[PDB]
Amino acid sequence: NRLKEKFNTEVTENLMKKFNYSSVMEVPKIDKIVVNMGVGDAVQNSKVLDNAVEELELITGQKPLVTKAKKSIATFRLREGMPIGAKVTLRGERMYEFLDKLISVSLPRVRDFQGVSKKAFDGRGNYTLGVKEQLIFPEIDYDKVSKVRGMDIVIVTTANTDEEARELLANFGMP
Amino acid sequence: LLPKRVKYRRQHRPKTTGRSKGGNYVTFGEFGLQATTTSWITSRQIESARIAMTRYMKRGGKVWIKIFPHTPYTKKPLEVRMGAGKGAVEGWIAVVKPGRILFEVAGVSEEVAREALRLASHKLPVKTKFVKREE
Amino acid sequence: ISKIDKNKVRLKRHARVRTNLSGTAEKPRLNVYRSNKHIYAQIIDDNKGVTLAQASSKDSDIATTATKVELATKVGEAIAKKAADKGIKEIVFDRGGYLYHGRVKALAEAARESGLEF
Amino acid sequence: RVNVTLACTECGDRNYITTKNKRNNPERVEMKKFCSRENKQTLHRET
Amino acid sequence: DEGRITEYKGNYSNYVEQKELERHREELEYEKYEKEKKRLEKAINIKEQK
Amino acid sequence: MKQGIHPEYHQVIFLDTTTNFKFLSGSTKTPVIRLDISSDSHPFYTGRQKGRVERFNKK
Amino acid sequence: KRNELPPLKMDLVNLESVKNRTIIRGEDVSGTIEGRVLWKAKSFSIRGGDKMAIIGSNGTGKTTFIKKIVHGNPGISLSPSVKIGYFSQKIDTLELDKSILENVQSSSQQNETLIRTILARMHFFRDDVYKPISVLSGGERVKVALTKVFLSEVNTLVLDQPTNFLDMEAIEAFESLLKEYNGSIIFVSHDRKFIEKVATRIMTIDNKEIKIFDGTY
Amino acid sequence: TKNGRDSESKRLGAKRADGQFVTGGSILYRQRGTKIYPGENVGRGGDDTLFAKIDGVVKFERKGRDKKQVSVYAVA
RNA sequence: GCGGGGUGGAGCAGUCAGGUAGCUCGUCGGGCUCAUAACCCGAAGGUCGUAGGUUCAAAUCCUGCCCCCGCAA
RNA sequence: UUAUUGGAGGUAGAGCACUGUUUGGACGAGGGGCCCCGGGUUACCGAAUUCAGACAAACUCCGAAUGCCAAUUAAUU
RNA sequence: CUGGGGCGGUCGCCUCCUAAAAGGUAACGGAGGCGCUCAAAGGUUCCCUCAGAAUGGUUGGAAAUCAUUCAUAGAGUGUAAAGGCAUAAGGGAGCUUGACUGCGAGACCUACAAGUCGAGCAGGGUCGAAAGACGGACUUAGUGAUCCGGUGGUUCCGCAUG
RNA sequence: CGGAUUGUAGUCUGCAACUCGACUACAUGAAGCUGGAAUCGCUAGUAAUCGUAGAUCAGCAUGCUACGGUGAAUACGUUCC
RNA sequence: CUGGUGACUAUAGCAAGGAGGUCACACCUGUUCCCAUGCCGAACACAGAAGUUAAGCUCCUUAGCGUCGAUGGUAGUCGAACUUACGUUCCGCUAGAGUAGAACGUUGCCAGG
Ligand SMILES: Nc1ncnc2c1ncn2[C@@H]1O[C@H](COP(=O)(O)OP(=O)(O)OP(=O)(O)O)[C@@H](O)[C@H]1O
Ligand SMILES: [K+]
Ligand SMILES: [Mg+2]
Ligand SMILES: [Mg+2]
Ligand SMILES: [Mg+2]
Ligand SMILES: [Mg+2]
Ligand SMILES: [Mg+2]
Ligand SMILES: [Mg+2]
Ligand SMILES: [Mg+2]
Ligand SMILES: [Zn+2]
């Protein structure tokens, strides 16, 4: 549980010395990671669904929830009940396993890595990756199929300030 | 002058008794026109009056109409026995009760304002008087 | 993130239960309150707001080191003994806005088994 | 969507009328309903 | 056809022949109906003008 | 964690032998594992980074 | 009027035909099961655009000949271009798979509106494509098999007893489609009068031996 | 013209006033929806009528500023 | 105000009963020919007036709007 | 019938708290015509927000007088 | 029927307003719907709370799906409108068939015929640990007299007797 | 298979190869699976195919002019164009 | 005083600031059996108490939003007397808005101190 331990001792030390909190329970943590795939090509063909559904499972080690429309639109021909692919929620040791399997592994597999954004916080201390090349996870085996689909990751935290978000993510290893 | 859209084109024709629910105290400008009597006022009358004032005054001048004809009114086709529904629309009216300010004007002296609003008063079905602001 | 008050969602549920069940002297209701440490319990008529009995897992000879569900069972026995005297044979169980699976269920079974038969 | 007569599977008495989609519930539909002769709640199919 | 069992004395050729004549008879009667209706509606319109 | 929906997901030990960045985690590979570029091998995280004018003045 | 149904119109989504010098070849295919010479070891070859046919009495081995084509290479020589569409003499579909849609879309990668439109040309309406495949009548099972095997990505069709339960006014659409198909077809049928339009390389199995000529007569 | 219709009226409203003696099963307030809620010894019908269940005396009451109720209380 | 219609350039089917937009003439390029016409071979040309909904699917059903034809006025 | 008490109900009025209408302003949310990817505009401003003033049978945050329904009450009839 | 008749329109039912703060109230007065639907969109037990805006984020109005914060109702409530529902009547899940039998004090409306509500008793039950809920649906339309004939059942008669 | 196109690096000529020469090496590797209605040439060392040479010319030829190597098929016959 | 739980039209609320904790309640440690999530022990539930008052909770102050809200006066109006005027006169009731102002809750039962 290397990264839990890392966070608890070293990063907590650094960050509370930095921000001068009155207690540890002020310190921000991560409540969840949320993956999304968000694909409207299933109006066309539903094989698309089961494909990305399987790849999400392969990545996160757990089956994904299928998201569904709630309202209908005529441009995309999207209607209440037709799924738009899937999400996943992750919290626990799965959270940290996924964090590391990004930072140590696949974000170095970026083709052109100029750090990563300093702006992509909503304004509460909570971050998104809009990922392009979904096969930078190993287990896809992208010979069989080539629609990467991209992906969205959403890290969610108990921080107030985007500053604290940046600094905690820095202590994780994210630019 | 019309509304762009209304829910019910065939309304009841409004009440004329009483006095103003508001629009009595001159607000925007310096001078105004105040009804002493009750009648209806139309798009046509308003256009005419506003034209009259804006011609009597040079480009130096500012006008605020203070009423709008929300309420439509009907008239039947010609040479038609009574009944058989309710007629089409032929106009739009603002009701006016005594007290209410019809026009307000700012960018001039009181003599010019008096003459302009005098010229306009003759193009409405209503007796008017000339108003200045209060304390 | 804003964290959520379990007590408040519970009480919002409690009200929906209490819309139906109210109690009376003929049969009062068995108030139940839970906490991460231990349980409090009352038996009350709500025509007058007059708690007819009480027992708690806090201040008693019931208090022991096991905050196990058995301590809930003993709260049940305690209100059973302390209430059967006062002429209370039947009652309306209050779920409390909790769920009837654990400590709540254990207290209820205890009270049933201790003569305070619903 | 059509009219439906039920009937008890141990006497043969109808005892109930109702309605059903002939599309969505196409089969000979069956439900447990009181039967006034046996004085027991009994399985009643359609006829 | 649509649950209606039509019966036909003879051979499959006779089926073809009989159904052919029946199709033809039906189309003709339909054309007659449409034509007549058209005519009477036109009459109605003229008479209303007057 | 239910039973019947999750695939196998056990512990695994990654390795960037380009610097032997040897690391522990969990995955679905089925426990000796390769890595090719990582934090201690990538130009950003490691800091390192590998003209017509010059080309013309060569000649 | 009678609400007259629109006619049968079958489709083949596309064959980007290449017409190259040969599609199939094989040599000395020992035709037997056990103790029975069903046919002699013989060669064969099928070329770009061939409306190959087969004619044989009962218990000959036409079906097994087609099975040798579709599986195994004993004395056979295939290429990676040919992608067979196998229509069986049996069902070949999933009986209680919960929709014609599913059982078809299993083997094809096309849009829902095109596939339901093709089914509608076959006269399987909006609320009928969710019917189970066991419930169905024979002729419409045959039609659904054919649609699945069309919208399969294929260029050569392999049809053991089509036209079998179908009706006189879909067999004509099928006649014309096969007449007009830019690609290769191989098939069995006992209807010489159906074959009159279709065949270009007629075959004949008999007396444990084989013959193969070209054109009709 | 495209109009000229309306439906029968249904005689909604109060049918037994306040401070009044009422027998069981007596309609009090026919309505549509809970224009008025029930109270004590009052039931709400399928069509939202309000009927007494016991003999007694009617009292319309308050239930929080946009919500009334009605209670049939016994007498002695 | 009432009633019918608007589908490549022209005229017509298809709308009733929703399932891949069709017919004749024409247009464009090429052929034949001393050249043009005819004729032969290919190809373009259609948000089915428009804007909204229903539908897996709209020329098709529903809504709204702009024109066209008669009647009237 | 009146006195008293209580009660249901949404009218005239009034108001804009929703529904729609509407004036003049302050910003604007970003488009559009036009000029040279970006940047301009004596302009629509679809909107959002806000200040002030206004409209309503089928709007109401509010809400009369009357009328009504009754009362273990009194009086006159 | 009808501001003569006639044409045009309408004829029965449901909801608003006219309708004058009980109820009721007309007109060829103004606006709209109905002639169904649902074996769950019913019953019950558990749980959940929306729409919309700002921001961050791939296929980009970032409108598809996601994350957060705001947001008390502007969503949804099968379907017209009104009255109501967020202590849910709205949305999911598990089990079931009370969309039961015989009735029914007392009431509303009411010319009549009809229509509506209905506790409660008994029988035999689904759900819930129990209390208890349940004689369809958030409510109000979603219908058609008698004669006649058809079908089934029956401790009913059966032209002297059977 | 074919070798278009484009990228880089080079060689020769020249007063200088952007417009605008040829050539090379490397990289890339398009269209094209023997051509619709129509239509051309050829009767023998011809047609067909493979190379070579030369004038113009600093340099540039799939063209022109000329050379050889291999080497056919058929001509019933004049009914038709 | 804390906690539980009822009652009253938010005068009770929203908002801002500040404060307290091992006796409560909380966050909190984990999925160990009951139990559970169209996926995750987030939730639900359970074995817990190493840890922290940060947050939730509760308490103090403030009248910025919301709520409540007079008197006086006004519109309106039953009735009456005159008259037909887009009305007046007399009496009785009596708004709505607003203005001053109220208010940052109060009690009832029970276990603890
Ligand atoms: N498993 C088996 N065991 C024994 N004999 C078999 C087996 N399978 C097939 N056969 C025989 O092999 C021959 C196969 O006949 P097949 O179906 O190929 O003929 P066909 O040309 O399709 O004729 P048709 O369909 O008109 O009968 C027949 O004799 C059949 O009886
Ligand atoms: K005048
Ligand atoms: Mg009902
Ligand atoms: Mg008014
Ligand atoms: Mg009003
Ligand atoms: Mg008349
Ligand atoms: Mg007359
Ligand atoms: Mg009334
Ligand atoms: Mg007899
Ligand atoms: Zn029975």
**C-alpha span between F11 and A71 (Å, rounded):** 42
The helix or strand, by DSSP H or E, that contains position A6, with its residue range, turns out to be helix A2-6
- Does residue E46 lie within 7 Å of nucleic acid chain I, judged by its CB? no
Nucleic acid strand M: bases within 7 A of protein CB: 3-10, 24-28, 30-31, 34-49, 51-57, 75-76, 86-87, 108-113
Residue G49 and residue G15 in contact, taking contact as beta carbons nearer than 8 Å: no
Residue D18 and residue D6 in contact, taking contact as beta carbons nearer than 8 Å: yes
Per-residue burial over E4-19, b = 16 or more CB atoms within 10 Å of its CB, e = otherwise: eeeeeeeeeeeeeeee
User: In the complex, which subunits touch D with 3 or more CB pairs below 8 angstroms?
Assistant: none
Q: Who's near B55: CB < 8 A, 6+ residues apart?
A: none
Name all domains of chain B by residue range, CATH numbers in brackets: 23-135 (3.90.1170.10)
- Name the closest-CA residue to atom 26, ligand 1: G58
Decide: G6 in ligand 1 pocket, CB within 6 A: no
Which residues in B61-119 belong to E strands, given as ranges? 63-65, 71-74, 89-96, 101-105
Q: Is C94 exposed, middle or buried (0-12, 13-18, 19+ CB in 10 A)?
A: buried
The helix or strand, by DSSP H or E, that contains position G211, with its residue range, turns out to be strand G209-212
- Tell me the residues of chain F between 1 and 59 that have a Cβ less than 8 Å away from chain A: 1, 5-7, 9, 14, 21, 23-29, 35-39, 41-45
F14 forms bridges with which residues in the sheet? F23
For B18-21, which contacts have Cβ atoms below 8 Å and span 24 or more sequence positions?
A: B18/B97, B19/B97, B19/B98, B19/B99, B20/B97, B20/B98, B20/B99, B20/B100
Could you tell me which residues of G are annotated as the binding site?
Answer: 36, 58-59, 61-64, 89, 137-140
- Does residue C98 lie within 7 Å of nucleic acid chain M, judged by its CB? yes
**Domain segments of chain C as ranges:** 20-109
Single out the residue of B97, B70, B96 nearest to residue B12, CA to CA: B70
* DSSP letter, residue G68: H
Nucleic acid strand J: bases within 7 A of protein CB: 5-9, 12-15, 20-24, 52-59, 62, 69-72
**C-alpha span between H47 and G151 (Å, rounded):** 57
- C-alpha separations of C73 from A135, C44, C63, C87 in Å: 56, 19, 12, 21
Nearest ligand 1 atom, CA G205: 21
**C-alpha span between D11 and D7 (Å, rounded):** 8
- In the A/C pair of chains, how many CB contacts fall below 8 A? 4
Q: How far is H40 from chain B (nearest CA, A)?
A: 44
- The amino acid occupying position E1 is D
Residue C100 and residue C118 in contact, taking contact as beta carbons nearer than 8 Å: no
Residue B103 and residue B57 in contact, taking contact as beta carbons nearer than 8 Å: no
**C-alpha span between B32 and B114 (Å, rounded):** 9
**C-alpha span between G205 and G193 (Å, rounded):** 18
Query: How many angstroms separate the most distant Cα atoms in chain H?
Result: 62
Helix C70-84, helix C103-113: angle, nearest 10: 40
Question: Which CATH number applies to C20-109?
Answer: 3.30.420.100
CB contact G111 to A (< 8 Å): yes
Single out the residue of H57, H51, H50 nearest to residue H19, CA to CA: H57
Alpha carbon G212 to chain centroid, angstroms: 19
**C-alpha span between G190 and G208 (Å, rounded):** 18
What is the domain count for chain D? 1
Count how many residues are written for chain F: 59
Best of C1, C2, C3, C4 to disrupt the A interface by mutation (most A CBs within 10 Å)? C1
Q: Is E35 exposed, middle or buried (0-12, 13-18, 19+ CB in 10 A)?
A: exposed
Q: What is the full DSSP assignment across A100-120?
A: HIIIIIISTT-SS-----S--
- Does residue A101 lie within 7 Å of nucleic acid chain M, judged by its CB? no
Q: Who's near G84: CB < 8 A, 6+ residues apart?
A: G69, G70, G154, G156, G157, G158
**C-alpha span between A91 and A97 (Å, rounded):** 10
Residue A95 and residue A3 in contact, taking contact as beta carbons nearer than 8 Å: no
CB contact G57 to A (< 8 Å): no
Q: How was it solved?
A: cryo-EM
- Nucleotide K13 C1' to residue H6 CA (A): 10
Residue A175 and residue F44 in contact, taking contact as beta carbons nearer than 8 Å: yes
**C-alpha span between B10 and B75 (Å, rounded):** 11
- C-alpha separations of G33 from B50, G64, G81, H67 in Å: 107, 9, 30, 88
- The amino acid occupying position G57 is S
- Structural domain of D3: 1-46
Count how many residues are written for chain D: 47
Q: Which of residues 90-119 of G touch strand I (CB under 7 A)?
A: 112-114, 116-118
- The amino acid occupying position G103 is N
Name all domains of chain A by residue range, CATH numbers in brackets: 4-168 (3.30.1440.10)
Helical spans, DSSP H, in G44-106? 62-70, 100-105
